[PDB]
Amino acid sequence: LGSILPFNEETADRVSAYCEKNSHGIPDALVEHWEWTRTRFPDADKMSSRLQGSWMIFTARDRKPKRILEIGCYSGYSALAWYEGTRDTKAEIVTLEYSPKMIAASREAFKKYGVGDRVKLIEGPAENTLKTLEGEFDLIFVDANKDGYAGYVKTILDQGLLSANGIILCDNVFARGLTIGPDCAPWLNDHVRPYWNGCGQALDKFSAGLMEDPRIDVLLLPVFDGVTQIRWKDG
Amino acid sequence: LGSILPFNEETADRVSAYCEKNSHGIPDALVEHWEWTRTRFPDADKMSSRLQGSWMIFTARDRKPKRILEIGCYSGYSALAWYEGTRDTKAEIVTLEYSPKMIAASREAFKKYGVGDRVKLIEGPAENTLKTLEGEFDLIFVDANKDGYAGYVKTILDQGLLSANGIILCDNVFARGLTIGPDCAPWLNDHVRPYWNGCGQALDKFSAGLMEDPRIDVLLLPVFDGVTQIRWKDGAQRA
Ligand SMILES: Nc1ncnc2c1ncn2[C@@H]1O[C@H](CSCC[C@H](N)C(=O)O)[C@@H](O)[C@H]1O
Ligand SMILES: Nc1ncnc2c1ncn2[C@@H]1O[C@H](CSCC[C@H](N)C(=O)O)[C@@H](O)[C@H]1O
């Protein structure tokens, strides 16, 4: 017996709606931004869900990080969630993105919502820009190109960008299930199958690699699209 | 469309095994206790999985709670997970249990494991013993009678048994899916369906009640059999 409840599509969606209804809601402005994003961009399925937004805000309010690093900004949704979750502490948020279209999208949203005082967006290939950062981050959200995750984590660990009591959260580790195998998401539309299959293989390599690193404790949690939590091994 | 990936039974089990393979495992001794529990008891399905064990240990090492409270000990598996996760700080672990059979099992288990004085099993109906507890806990794991969760959380908040920065984790809140609706777990064994439907009705009332409590932030996490995370609202924290 396993640790994951089996649901069909309709029922998964019902249970997700139930979780939303019975969890703290995200702000109206964030809902608005989520819908705006889905209206403007054909690849908006890359953006985190509403429930995931609730999770980001809860996690930031709970952990109270002093500085947050995000890799993969897209339209700025998850950055706005980190911002909401850190209103009390006024945490610095750094987010990395390489697409001009999405840079423009994000700066537009940040101006509209009034979050530029704490959110810093750095434009460029994250594999390069990540290395240029200094100091440390208490919470790091890795959510960019899947085939880059290993490199990102390597940089983060090698340069000490993760604070002693910090956590790394890696998103979409399951690649809709295809990380486990090409046969693990029959419901997925064939049109996006190549992409996600590509991500799956990469994310499998990544996952296996984490288990070979004596510096860290690793937990792959079967929630959302798969979330890997990484921390420094004690002490 | 939402946040949860749909899996059929076989595939869900493969994905669980994948998560285990790709997460740090529980200590050998704890595996031995888990296996022993499954051999000893016919109702061992009440026990958490191995992956959940890794999650408990990770969570404890991460949050570094000073004291941990647990409601529902069963055979001691989750208590020993918390124990493993707090070896460096020697956190006090209080665990509440009412079944004579499981109390005997757990005390023997704790002695075999060689836990110190820091693991404390309190016998009796948790609804009454929980009120007798003093001080505060940084992590509280609710895993007892599903129809009691609301009452437990109420006591916990009313008496300030949760620390300012503490968290409550409530397990099995989905009741296999039946908390959401009686048609949400067609795979479920019919023999345990009435039981879990009862649990689901109680847990649905529980979940709705949390949303009305102005003291707390709530996140119902669609992981395992449903895990409700509860914290004080920033403004509701007290000195
Ligand atoms: N090498 C790279 N460097 C920087 N950004 C990258 C990259 N590869 C991909 N990206 C960006 O990573 C993003 C992934 S989607 C991010 C979603 C966002 N975090 C949310 O939750 O909504 C895309 O915007 C993409 O352009
Ligand atoms: N009212 C009550 N007071 C105290 N314990 C109770 C109770 N109702 C049920 N229980 C106990 O709660 C336990 C739930 S199963 C707990 C499993 C354990 N936490 C693990 O993860 O392995 C059972 O052992 C049951 O006997």
Å between B238 CA and nearest CA of chain A = 15
What resolution in angstroms does the PDB record give? 1.9
A219 to B9: CB separation less than 8 angstroms, yes or no: no
Contact B206, B149 (CB under 8 A): yes
Q: At what angle do helices A50-63 and A28-40 cross, to 10 degrees?
A: 140
Long-range contact set of residues B174-178: C-beta below 8 Å, sequence gap at least 24? B174/A5, B174/A15, B174/B200, B174/B203, B174/B222, B174/B225, B174/B226, B175/B146, B175/B199, B175/B200, B175/B203, B175/B225, B175/B226, B176/A5, B176/B200, B176/B225, B177/A5, B177/A7, B177/A11, B177/A15
Q: How many CA atoms lie within 13 A of B29 on its CB side?
A: 12
Proximal ligand: closest to the CA of B121:
2
Interface test with B, best of A19, A139, A196 (most B CBs within 10 A): A19
Q: What is the CATH number of the domain that holds A24?
A: 3.40.50.150
What tokens does B212 get? Answer: 């009305």
B74 annotated to bind ligand: yes
Q: Which domain, by its residues, includes B47? A: 1-239
Element (H, E) at A165: strand A162-170
How far is it, in rounded angstroms, from Cα A37 to Cα A81?
Answer: 14
Give the Cα-Cα-Cα angle B73, B113, B31 (nearest 5 degrees). Answer: 75
- Which approach determined this entry? X-ray
Proximal ligand: closest to the CA of A129:
1
Contact A221, A163 (CB under 8 A): no
Q: How many CA atoms lie within 13 A of A20 on its CB side?
A: 19
Element (H, E) at B61: helix B50-63
What tokens does A108 get? Answer: 């537009």
A16 to B6: CB separation less than 8 angstroms, yes or no: no
B68 bridge partner residues: B93, B139
Q: At what angle do helices B9-21 and B50-63 cross, to 10 degrees?
A: 40
Domain count within chain B: 1
Q: Which of B83, B97, B101 to mutate to test the pocket of ligand 2 (most atoms within 8 A of CB)?
A: B97
A127 annotated to bind ligand: yes
Strand order in the sheet with B119-123: B119-123, B92-97, B67-71, B137-142, B162-170, B227-232, B216-221
